[PDB]
């Protein structure tokens, strides 16, 4: 891939005691894109052949995999970014009803993804072994995970990023 | 990949009490492209090695796989987009027989994909286990699925998107 | 991949009661490229590990695979496109012996691929089970297929596309 | 990929009773590039997991694979093209010691690849089963191939292309 | 991929007895990008199917893999680069609070990645066999590695690069 | 990929009885890039699943693989090119301490890679079977290779290329 190949005329800088946010926020935008693609198919890209189930039950790997991973972290992120992406191309150029409502959209989205995330991954963690007692899964069986530490780390990162994103997003939203 | 690298001169905005749709609709277009590619080969990209059949019948996985998945969701989407894509490059620039018939085409296509979809995936769902009683499949056998929840989610999304696409598509088609 | 990243100066449109074809035909060209790459290695890309032969004969999968699939559909297509591709870059710009003979080439190629296709895939179909009685294949054995429905669908599409390609190709070839 | 995205100013055409070759030859160049990439990793791209050896000898697949396929067809082609590629960018623009020697280089290379090819693939063919009696391969064993017909076809094509390449290459080399 | 396709107007060179660093540092930047992508998914890209565990314990490969590889080297690098990347696009053009603090950021990051690295890979090495005594891993079991020498080599390289990066980074930071 | 898409203004040619080298050397540069990428992940790209070890020792494939292949040929090449790459972008434009020292760097690097190579692959060859007597590898075991002939061929090529690279590199370095 390659994303962004024309940014040369940016001599105009800020002078006020504000609009520091847009710097921080474009930086976090670009950042999160890199951070994503660089580790995109490269942490969670694997986790299909990595959910070993101690059994001889047919299918129970698939069963428990959806049971505990309806969706992977990186998708909720990918979405979180895209919904939080549309205000970016908006704020690309501003001076001359929406504009600040773009800022607010950007806030509330990111908030939503945080909440529903912690609803799903309660404990902000990756259990080393998830058991499973699904229908075909004849009793409570065991179902492993690879690299739970890893995924936990990058999750801590992205959530911290979400917090700072919103804090400057809102710190300039709160101009009154 | 990278799609779209020249859009700078768009200072001209709308002033009437209409043409809000074209904003919404170009946004939904770009959106659905991202939404697609980001999760393109990344939800349904897997589902070949993910249709476990409890048996010892040769081939019965392939048999039942085509039996229940003639085609995957994402293809019907891919098509739905492309047939609904041609009016986009048309409406790229408009002011000066087709033009509104492009709008109507865009409506009726998306409608068609909705209908035939629900004909095929009746119940707007992903069954956790599809049985199968095909010729080689000696009796009614079991044939699993992975991530049925996941696919169900993104299907709910794309169908909602279809509804809103058409509603603004038609809301401006209905100018009289 | 990415194909085509410079098309901006196309303000000049047609005014006659003809040259509608070139619109349709460039559209079908671009279309078929997308249609291809999007589903390229994604329907027939699999079909090597998908030709289960009920036997214990060594090699009989390979034997019968070539026996019934000398070549896959998508190759005959790929070729069909490429031979039908050279007139495209020709007709890129036209006004000022070949020019109409390019049109005729484009016709007759596509016709040829249709005929030889139906010679090979007689019945415009994908049999769910092909038997096989090759030399090593000790008796008439069974040899399965995956997703025969799928491949049948996309074949119906590409052949319909061929028909319309030629019909406008020739409708403007028939100017007299 | 994408190769070639700037060719617009070519209004100047030929008027003599020659230089038809450069048309044919640039066309064959572009052609062979397409023809290659389209079927590049798509006929011979597979043939690693496709050389079944009826045995229980360890390694004998690798052994016999190198034994009968030191190198695949498509590499000899890839090279054949590249060595025959350098005169192309040379002849990109010509009018104002090398120039005709570029033409001759282009001839003799393509000739060489033809000869050494037929030295290696004697019979211009793909045997359905190659036996093998290598050291570890304990007796004469059997070692299969997939799609030998296919590869034979595309080989017939590329060799015919080589013949016509040289014939026009030389027909204009023979100007005296 | 392709990164960087517009750098032509650089006739202005340095004349002082300093700013040699920016040459060295842009070179190391570009370098490390190449060095990365060229060997990116090509040394550590494999190491999922390469951690053989002498056992019959289910999952113990995944268990011990995360146990000893929470994260691979190349990720810590990828990050190290990206955090050390933002000052680069800053120092792209300079003459006319941040500017030198960008230099200092660039220092301290790279330092941090060095330290935490050696915390994790103590001994600046790749053990040929890591044992493992995890919960499911019933006793102390054995768990192999592939190419430990290789990875050790490229690690020695990247750490040396870090040292020189910082030494010139700081040698020009230390201007007083 | 695609590398190099702007080279049009090169009407200025050489007239002296020298600077033939820069032609040869840019050609060899471009060449080696093509030669690489075309066969890059396509000869040595495989050799992970291709090192069959006649045993029942766990891990002994990995063990002996690193034992005999610390690093693959194509990496030593990749490096050899990159270290020999920096003088290229330097010599892109020259007329108006480094310049000739770039030439000398280019020499001595390529020399180094030759020497250390032959230190490692002594005999300029690919043994059809490497035995192995590592710790876990319980006795002297056997460990196979695929396509040793192939790799030998392309190695002969790249080393010859190195020789000619240096000979013209130095023939113009030796101007006095």
Swiss-Prot record, chains A, B, C, D, E, F:
GO terms for biological process: cell-cell signaling; gap junction assembly; gap junction-mediated intercellular transport; sensory perception of sound; transmembrane transport. Changing residue 44 to S: In DFNA3A; does not affect protein trafficking; affects the ability to form functional channels; dominant negative effect. Keywords: Calcium, Cell junction, Cell membrane, Deafness, Disease variant, Disulfide bond, Ectodermal dysplasia, Gap junction, Hearing, Ichthyosis, Membrane, Metal-binding, Non-syndromic deafness, Palmoplantar keratoderma, Transmembrane, Transmembrane helix. Changing residue 75 to Q: In PPKDFN; the mutant protein completely prevents the formation of functional channels. Residues 14-20 are cytoplasmic. Residues 41-73, 120-152 are extracellular. GO terms for molecular function: calcium ion binding; gap junction channel activity; gap junction channel activity involved in cell communication by electrical coupling; identical protein binding. The keyword Membrane applies. It is linked to Deafness, autosomal recessive, 1A: A form of non-syndromic sensorineural hearing loss. Sensorineural deafness results from damage to the neural receptors of the inner ear, the nerve pathways to the brain, or the area of the brain that receives sound information. This is Gap junction beta-2 protein. It comes from Homo sapiens (Human). The lineage of its organism: Eukaryota, Metazoa, Chordata, Craniata, Vertebrata.
